């Protein structure tokens, strides 16, 4: 059938971000067990992301920035206190124990998964530890240090001419877009909430520049988009983009922070709706890299990522969750699916239809 590759290491669960931390990487392990407990592990191929060398990171990043990140330990923050302002590390995205070891694995799955994906080894590579997109060339933005998505895309361009990057998330992917804003080799379709949101970028008019003038698609959205609206905007836009662009290997960054009830996001997507997008992209039958970003409400994120793994395996998983290691977190419901909240969808059909027409118009200028 559809060969699938999994990337996971246990130790990633011990990287405590800090007291009062929205980002909790250990959530992925609370996900891994749902793969084993449901039995998806046997049908799948499971690996662990190996260490990413400092030189490997010096493909899109600067040498000085990676050296700074590697040389900062929690005891010696005093020596580098001056450089913590030039690189935006220490406050919004504070430094903690084994930070570089954390990026040895968050990035180790993207490059090493794209290695198998570009080669004739798999049609779908999975890495829930990755999905970090806000990191800049020589700066840490958001909760990201090394941009695993950009490294994977660069590693993919060696084997493929045109690469489509789909950003299923609630945050605009700044690092990927700016990394490929002025090139036609990579088009970055990004579905994200726009306004007075974190990234600040991703305007409808940010359609590109230079040779890649019409190779930057952004779909701004408001808060609370339902499952139906997201799917009905996702399938045709993606189909039209591929028809006009002929991608060779697509990179889907799935962010479970798009689910309803996340502790940072404000979207209303359910697990079924979030898996509808991955299945839609599967219909086209192209190589699909899968980066798992965001992931802040650890229960909804764990359930969503396990379901996405099930979809990748084209298997069936019961709604009733089997008693797991962290069942106490799952609470009295015991359900694998989450009921959508009662929040209003601010994306009216006229707004969605107009943005879709603008995107189609911009796609008509594709050589």
């Amino acid at each position: 059938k559809k060969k699938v590759c999994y990337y996971y290491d246990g130790d990633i669960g011990n990287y405590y971000y800090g007291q009062g931390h929205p980002m909790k990487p250990h959530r992925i392990r609370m996900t891994h067990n749902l793969l084993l407990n449901y039995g998806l592990y046997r049908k799948m191929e499971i690996y662990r992301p190996h260490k990413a060398t400092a030189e490997e990171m010096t493909k899109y990043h600067s040498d000085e920035y990676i050296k700074f990140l590697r040389s900062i330990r929690p005891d010696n923050m005093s020596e580098y206190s001056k450089q913590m302002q030039r690189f935006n590390v220490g406050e919004d995205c504070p430094v903690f124990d084994g930070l570089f070891e954390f990026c040895q694995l968050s990035t180790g799955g993207s490059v090493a998964g794209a290695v198998k994906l570009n080669r004739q080894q798999t049609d779908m590579a999975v890495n829930w530890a990755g999905g970090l997109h806000h990191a800049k060339k020589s700066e840490a933005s958001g909760f990201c240090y090394v941009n695993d998505i950009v490294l994977a895309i660069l590693e993919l361009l060696k084997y493929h001419q045109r690469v489509l990057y789909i950003d299923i998330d609630i945050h605009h992917g700044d690092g990927v877009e700016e990394a490929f804003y002025t090139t036609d080799r990579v088009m970055t379709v990004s579905f994200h909430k726009y306004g007075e949101y974190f990234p600040g970028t991703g305007d409808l008019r940010d359609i590109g520049a230079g040779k890649g003038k019409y190779y930057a698609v952004n779909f701004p959205m408001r808060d609370g988009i339902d499952d139906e609206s997201y799917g009905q905007i996702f399938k045709p836009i993606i189909s039209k983009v591929m028809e006009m662009y002929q991608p060779s290997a697509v990179v889907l960054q799935c962010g479970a922070d798009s689910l309803s009830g996340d502790r940072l996001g404000c979207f209303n997507l359910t697990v079924k709706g979030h898996a509808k997008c991955v299945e839609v992209v599967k219909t086209f039958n192209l190589p699909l890299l899968m980066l798992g970003g965001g992931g802040y409400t650890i229960r909804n994120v764990a359930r969503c990522w396990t379901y996405e793994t099930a979809v990748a395996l084209d298997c069936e998983i019961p709604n009733e969750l089997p008693y797991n290691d962290y069942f106490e977190y799952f609470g009295p419901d015991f359900k694998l699916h989450i009921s959508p909240s009662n929040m209003t969808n601010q994306n009216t059909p006229e707004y969605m239809e107009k943005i879709k027409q603008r995107l189609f118009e911009n796609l008509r200028m594709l050589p």
Binding site: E196, C266, S341, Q346
Partner: protein, 417 residues
């Protein structure tokens, strides 16, 4: 050239000015304002009737504290004008008498304010009105009752006032003096805070993503994040609609914002609503009868920077509409507000304090003890706090006398209601 309707917007102004002038300098005027005079065309005194006729013809009403009684009675007997509404709101030790006055004159707004005051001070003051007090809630209900049984309720000991200092937030308790019962630390930076119904809501986190919201009261209960990233956004509580509003704010791009969002405690959702006419940042919020008043802050200037704003914006929550007042604030800059009765006691700069009644257009000033104050209203008392550790003072509105009333915090970031 053949047919059109001519509507003179100045007809009312002209006729009012002319009637004022001719009447003052020399039945319709009164009958056009009061139904009872219309019906007829001892109870009131000559001095009070002078202000009554001045309001009838000219509409110029100033009060001194000793006449409210009549300014109530007459204004509820002679007419149903806005004078009665203003006097009753203004009236909103003396609780036991105002209860009887509101009951006898059927005022469903003064009655609840008086019941609140009577219930809060039931211990210090230990027929159907007593049952209403007991049913509302309470701290010796059974002892007061002894001094039926099912017509009683309890809420334990709700925190009167909260305050964030330096990072832990202290749950100050007011006892009829100050007490410190309650303490809880936070690991997060607090961009804004609001006290909903005896509970503390705090919004903040990292400065590029200051959306995390917590309900710490086991503390650290997570709540729905806001869909916007704004700093110094005014956070207001409206138990009337059970909604917490987040107005204004400054974006991370150094740009002021005019967006408004509101939370729902029951539904645990955030919903966007109408925008503000003028974008401001750091403005003080005041919820009066459901209408949000945004005072001061910073406003755009020189196309790239901000200047101390002195505007007053009004967000009508029932109609969800924003409008800017046609007049200006006495001062501008960093500001703090606290709702008391129908007033906002706004404090800014130094030795400056203004009692502002937004339904009308006038600002008063009270002398301070001539020392960055932060004000906070209680059930019936006003507490002023110094930004840096006397550390607390009690303001008597009638006499303007600052009387010194336990503080363990070096700094004072927030002083919630």
């Amino acid at each position: 050239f053949v047919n059109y309707t001519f509507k003179d917007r100045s007809h009312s102004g002209r006729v009012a000015q002319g009637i004022m002038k001719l009447c003052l300098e020399e039945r319709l005027v009164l009958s056009a304002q009061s139904c009872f005079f219309r019906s007829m065309f001892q109870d009131v005194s000559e001095s009070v009737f002078q202000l009554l006729v001045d309001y009838i013809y000219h509409g110029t009403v100033k009060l001194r504290a000793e006449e409210l009684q009549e300014i109530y009675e007459v204004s509820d007997m002679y007419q149903l004008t806005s004078l009665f509404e203003e006097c009753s709101r203004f009236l909103a030790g003396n609780c036991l008498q105002v209860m009887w006055l509101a009951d006898r004159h059927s005022d469903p707004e003064l009655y609840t304010a008086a019941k609140h005051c009577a219930k809060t001070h039931l211990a210090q003051l230990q027929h159907r009105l007593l049952t209403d007090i007991i049913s509302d809630g309470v701290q010796n209900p059974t002892e007061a009752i002894e001094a039926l049984r099912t017509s009683l309720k309890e809420i334990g000991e709700n925190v009167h006032i909260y305050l964030i200092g330096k990072s832990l937030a202290v749950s100050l308790h007011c006892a009829e003096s100050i007490s410190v019962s309650g303490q809880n630390s936070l690991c997060h930076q607090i961009t804004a805070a609001c006290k909903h119904g005896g509970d503390l809501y705090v919004v903040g986190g990292s400065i590029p993503r200051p959306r995390r919201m917590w309900k710490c009261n086991v503390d650290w209960e997570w709540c729905a994040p806001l869909p916007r990233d704004r700093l110094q956004h005014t956070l207001v509580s409206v138990p009337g609609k059970d909604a917490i509003y987040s107005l204004g704010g400054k974006t991370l791009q150094d740009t002021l914002s005019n967006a408004v969002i509101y939370y729902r405690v029951g539904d645990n959702v955030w919903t966007e609503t109408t925008q503000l006419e003028v974008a401001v940042s750091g403005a003080a919020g005041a919820n009066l009868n459901g209408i949000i008043y945004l005072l001061g802050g910073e406003e755009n200037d020189l196309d790239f920077f901000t200047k101390p704003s002195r505007l007053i914006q009004c967000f009508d929550t029932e109609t969800d509409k924003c409008h800017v007042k046609p007049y200006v604030l006495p001062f501008a800059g960093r500001m703090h507000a606290a709702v008391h009765k129908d007033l906002v006691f706004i404090v800014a700069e130094g030795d400056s304090l203004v009692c502002y009644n937004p339904l009308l257009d006038s600002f008063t000033r009270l002398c301070l003890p001539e020392a960055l104050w932060k004000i906070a209203s209680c059930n019936g008392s006003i507490y002023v706090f110094r930004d840096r550790y006397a550390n607390t003072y009690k303001l008597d509105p009638a006499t303007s006398a600052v009387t010194v009333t336990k503080v363990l915090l070096t700094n004072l970031q927030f002083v919630l209601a």
